[model samples]
Target: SLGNGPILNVLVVLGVVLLGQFVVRRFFKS
Candidate 1:
């Protein structure tokens, strides 16, 4: 499964984009 596909990467990015937004806002706010 070395180069089979990047499905996991896609999921990770989505999680970061979604949940990471909240974390960034909180940290940047103060």
Candidate 2:
């Protein structure tokens, strides 16, 4: 998660998180 093993995540989950972050940032951008 935010910390812990620095967490090696699954490829799909990683992709989703990055995509979600990008979307949120874009949609919320001022």
Candidate 3:
């Protein structure tokens, strides 16, 4: 089902940005 295409797009972008920040933070935490 192609439900909420725009919502999915927003989530995907947010996921990428948030994950990138999380990864960088983890790297610096070492």
Against the true structure, what is each candidate's TM-score? 0.48, 0.52, 0.64
Q: Give the top-scoring candidate (lDDT).
A: 3
Q: What is the per-residue lDDT of model 3 for residues 1-30, given as tens digits with 9 covering 90 to 100?
A: 257565877788899999899999999999
Best by TM-score: 3
Q: Which should have the higher TM-score, number 2 or number 3?
A: 3
Task: Predict model 2's lDDT versus the native.
Answer: 0.77
Clashes of 2: 0
Q: Which stretches of candidate 1 lie over 4 Å from their true place?
A: 22-30
Better of 1 and 3 by TM-score: 3
**What overall lDDT goes with each candidate model?**
0.84, 0.77, 0.85
lDDT of 1 by residue, 1-30 (tens): 346886888888898799978988999999
Worst 10 residues of 1 by lDDT: 1-10
Ranking by TM-score: 3, 2, 1
Q: What lDDT does model 3 reach?
A: 0.85
Candidate 2: regions farther than 4 A off = 1-9
Report the candidate with higher TM-score, 1 versus 2.
2
